[PDB]
Amino acid sequence: HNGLITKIWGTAGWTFNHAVTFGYPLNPTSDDKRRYKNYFISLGDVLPCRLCRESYKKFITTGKTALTNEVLRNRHTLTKWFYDVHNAVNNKLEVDYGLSYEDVVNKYESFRAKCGKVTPLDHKAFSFKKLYYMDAPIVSLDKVENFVRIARMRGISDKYFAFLELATVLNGDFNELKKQSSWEYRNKYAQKKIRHMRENAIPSIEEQGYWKGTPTIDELKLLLFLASNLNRTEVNDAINNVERLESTHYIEN
Amino acid sequence: HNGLITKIWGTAGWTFNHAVTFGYPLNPTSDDKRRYKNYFISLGDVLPCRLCRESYKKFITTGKTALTNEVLRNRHTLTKWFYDVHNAVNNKLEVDYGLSYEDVVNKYESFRAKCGKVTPLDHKAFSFKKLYYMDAPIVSLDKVENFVRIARMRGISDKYFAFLELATVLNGDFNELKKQSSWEYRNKYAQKKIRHMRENAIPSIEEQGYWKGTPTIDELKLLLFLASNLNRTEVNDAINNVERLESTHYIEN
Numbered sequence: 001h002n003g004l005i006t007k008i009w010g011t012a013g014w015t016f017n018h019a020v021t022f023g024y025p026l027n028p029t030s031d032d033k034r035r036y037k038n039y040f041i042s043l044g045d046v047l048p049c050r051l052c053r054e055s056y057k058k059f060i061t062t063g064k065t066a067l068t069n070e071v072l073r074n075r076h077t078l079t080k081w082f083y084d085v086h087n088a089v090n091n092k093l094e095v096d097y098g099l100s101y102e103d104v105v106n107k108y109e110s111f112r113a114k115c116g117k118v119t120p121l122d123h124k125a126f127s128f129k130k131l132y133y134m135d136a137p138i139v140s141l142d143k144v145e146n147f148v149r150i151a152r153m154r155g156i157s158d159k160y161f162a163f164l165e166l167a168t169v170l171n172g173d174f175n176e177l178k179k180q181s182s183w184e185y186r187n188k189y190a191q192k193k194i195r196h197m198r199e200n201a202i203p204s205i206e207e208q209g210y211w212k213g214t215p216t217i218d219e220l221k222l223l224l225f226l227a228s229n230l231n232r233t234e235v236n237d238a239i240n241n242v243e244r245l246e247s248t249h250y251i252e253n
Numbered sequence: 254h255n256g257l258i259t260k261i262w263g264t265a266g267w268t269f270n271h272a273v274t275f276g277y278p279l280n281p282t283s284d285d286k287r288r289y290k291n292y293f294i295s296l297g298d299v300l301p302c303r304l305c306r307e308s309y310k311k312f313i314t315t316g317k318t319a320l321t322n323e324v325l326r327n328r329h330t331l332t333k334w335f336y337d338v339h340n341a342v343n344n345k346l347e348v349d350y351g352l353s354y355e356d357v358v359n360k361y362e363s364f365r366a367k368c369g370k371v372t373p374l375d376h377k378a379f380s381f382k383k384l385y386y387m388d389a390p391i392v393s394l395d396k397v398e399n400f401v402r403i404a405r406m407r408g409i410s411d412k413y414f415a416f417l418e419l420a421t422v423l424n425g426d427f428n429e430l431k432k433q434s435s436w437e438y439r440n441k442y443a444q445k446k447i448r449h450m451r452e453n454a455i456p457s458i459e460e461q462g463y464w465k466g467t468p469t470i471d472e473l474k475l476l477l478f479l480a481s482n483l484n485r486t487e488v489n490d491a492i493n494n495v496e497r498l499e500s501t502h503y504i505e506n
């Protein structure tokens with residue numbers, strides 16, 4: 001019939017293909033360059049989703065995401081290129097994670113086989129944490145503040161605003177938030193939540209009732225951690241619905 | 254330097270590439286066939302591990318794992334082929350999971366985008382469970398029984414033998430064990446364990462002491478669930494060490 005659900009195969013697709021680029025030689029040979037290029041070209045033919053194939057092809061033939069011999073120069077250039085392609089897809093989907101190229105380098109380099117000290121167990125322990133540790137998507141603080149009132153009105157208790165309070169103090173600056181020890185907790189919390197909703201078919205936007213059009217309680221809890229399942233357009237749309245409800249409420253009482 | 258740790262990129266590699274095969278048309282065109290074949294041929298050039306590339310190439314040029322136009326006939330033939338390639342690698346590593354082609358079909362088909370009823374949330378809920386639900390490796394009951402005595406002697410309490418007791422009653426028949434409701438629990442338990450050991454650098458074989466050469470307590474708990482981090486050769490080796498210790502003990506007392 002159709003292709004496969006993007007949220008099922010997507011992450012494995014990225015993790016594996018980013019790993020492929022970090023397995024590229026520091027000094028490829030004309031042969032290596034040709035072998036990898038052809039691989040990445042063929043990748044565009046097999047992604048199990050038509051639209052995905054089209055966007056990817058478009059991306060690899062324009063701008064800085066263009067697959068060219070300069071990209072294939074070395075490991076740095078190849079890994080930087082795929083990092084950019086990944087950003088290109090994120091932007092297309094209007095979702096952000098706030099990861100710098102350096103972040104991606106520190107992550108995948110910890111995967112590098114270090115047959116020193118077969119790789120030692122304490123070294124792999126570190127690698128595995130980096131593999132299992134998921135980076136949840138980010139939403140700017142100015143967007144989230146539009147949901148605080150309704151979150152309170154719907155009964156979400158005080159403990160759920162803790163992280164938001166920390167973020168406010170740091171002016172919603174992600175580069176600073178990422179340096180906080182609690183950033184690790186933020187990601188683990190958001191991940192369990194996102195998984196909880198996915199596994200229990202919990203929608204992000206209220207389908208019926210008075211709250212129709214605004215975030216569900218679980219989605220609100222995610223937003224309070226500057227995370228969300230919604231993309232930029234969907235968040236702004238949710239904000240507009242929340243304000244329709246607040247405005248109309250004010251005028252009737 | 255080297256390639257990347259196989260246990261970090263491997264699973265994403267399989268999940269994504271199996272998803273690729275299920276995204277293959279029911280009736281490919283000469284063009285499709287050529288496009289996918291070239292992709293899978295190039296896959297062998299980019300796996301971030303030299304030995305892995307060699308084995309894969311060897312596999313796709315011999316026996317039933319050979320990449321040929323007959324394989325590329327349709328979705329059934331292509332998915333059956335990659336399932337066989339996966340089995341080939343499992344056999345090379347001497348690790349088993351007991352998954353039939355049908356098992357793999359039921360799993361990946363649940364990933365198929367079903368734009369009926371954008372795919373509905375309750376449908377995705379099912380898909381996500383299949384994605385997150387990991388199948389832990391299996392070890393035959395006759396192998397495991399060699400570790401029961403030492404497991405008892407080392408203080409492992411009774412609750413850890415529960416599943417083993419169920420398995421004994423079913424004659425260690427995996428096709429029957431997989432039909433049990435507790436099979437789902439078995440896999441979740443083994444998965445957390447395997448992850449716990451990986452994340453905490455807990456070895457599978459005692460490095461020092463009197464128990465040197467035999468499974469560590471955590472490894473023993475896994476074995477009691479007919480699971481293990483050890484491959485066939487390593488399990489038989491562990492058995493031999495356990496018997497050296499039992500035999501020598503008997504003769505000195």
Ligand SMILES: Cc1cc2nc3c(=O)[nH]c(=O)nc-3n(C[C@H](O)[C@H](O)[C@H](O)COP(=O)(O)OP(=O)(O)OC[C@H]3O[C@@H](n4cnc5c(N)ncnc54)[C@H](O)[C@@H]3O)c2cc1C
Nearest residue numbers: 006007010011013014052055083086087089097104134135
């Ligand atoms: C080549 C390719 C093309 C795709 N094209 C589409 C498409 O057009 N449409 C569509 O709907 N889906 C597409 N997808 C899937 C989509 O990109 C997501 O993977 C999917 O929506 C799942 O999202 P997620 O939130 O579950 O996790 P993911 O987005 O898969 O994973 C989140 C993780 O991504 C990492 N990350 C984020 N940004 C970067 C970066 N720049 N570099 C490295 N790691 C980063 C973080 O560490 C975070 O933990 C594509 C996937 C691939 C592999």
Ligand SMILES: Cc1cc2nc3c(=O)[nH]c(=O)nc-3n(C[C@H](O)[C@H](O)[C@H](O)COP(=O)(O)OP(=O)(O)OC[C@H]3O[C@@H](n4cnc5c(N)ncnc54)[C@H](O)[C@@H]3O)c2cc1C
Nearest residue numbers: 259260263264266267305308336339340342350357387388
């Ligand atoms: C193309 C390729 C070649 C590889 N070659 C090597 C190699 O030569 N040497 C090496 O050390 N590593 C190799 N690896 C990696 C290795 O196969 C494992 O993925 C890795 O050891 C991680 O094992 P794991 O136990 O963490 O999980 P994994 O083995 O990655 O995942 C376990 C999951 O595999 C699924 N599964 C098991 N059998 C099948 C099957 N036949 N069909 C579909 N799903 C199945 C189960 O559902 C189970 O949950 C290769 C990986 C790929 C993608």
